[PDB]
C-alpha cells in the first residue's frame, strides 16, 4: 500500500535520525548525507529497520540508493514489488 509504505519509511528515518516525521517528510527530496547529517551507520540502521518492518530481505548492496527519503521509499516499493506484496496505484 503506497501510503502505508510512505508513512512506515518516514517513521523509520525519523526514529533513526531523531528528527520529526513531518519535517523529514517536508525534506523528502533532500540528500541524506549532505543536508540531514546522516552517516553510513545510520543508513545501515534504516535498512535493517525497513527489513524488519515490512518483513522483507534487502541486499546490502542497495545501500547505494539510501540517499534521500524519496529514494528510500522507492527502494522499499521496488523490493516489495519483487516480493509480490506491493499494491500500487
Rounded to whole angstroms, the Cα distance separating 86 from 71 reads 16
Query: In the numeric block, which cell numbers belong to residue 73?
Result: 521509499
Single residue of 23, 26, 29, 87 touching Zn ion by CB under 5 A: 29
Closest CB 27 distance from Zn ion, rounded Å = 11
Closest CB 1 distance from Zn ion, rounded Å = 4
Rounded to whole angstroms, the Cα distance separating 63 from 33 reads 12
Of residues 33 and 44, the one with the C-beta less far from Zn ion: 44
CB atoms within 10 A of CB 47: 19
Q: Which residues in 60-89 contact Zn ion (CB under 5 A)?
A: none
Residue 6 in marked binding region: yes
Amino acid at each position: 500500500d503506497d501510503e502505508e509504505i510512505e508513512k512506515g519509511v518516514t517513521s523509520i528515518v525519523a526514529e533513526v535520525t531523531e528528527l520529526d516525521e513531518k519535517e523529514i517528510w517536508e525534506k523528502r527530496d533532500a540528500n541524506f548525507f549532505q543536508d540531514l547529517e546522516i552517516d553510513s551507520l545510520l543508513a545501515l540502521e534504516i535498512l535493517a529497520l525497513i527489513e524488519k518492518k515490512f518483513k522483507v530481505q534487502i541486499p546490502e548492496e542497495k545501500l547505494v540508493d539510501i540517499t534521500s527519503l524519496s529514494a528510500t521509499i522507492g527502494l522499499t516499493k521496488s523490493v516489495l514489488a519483487e516480493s509480490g506484496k506491493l499494491e500500487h496505484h
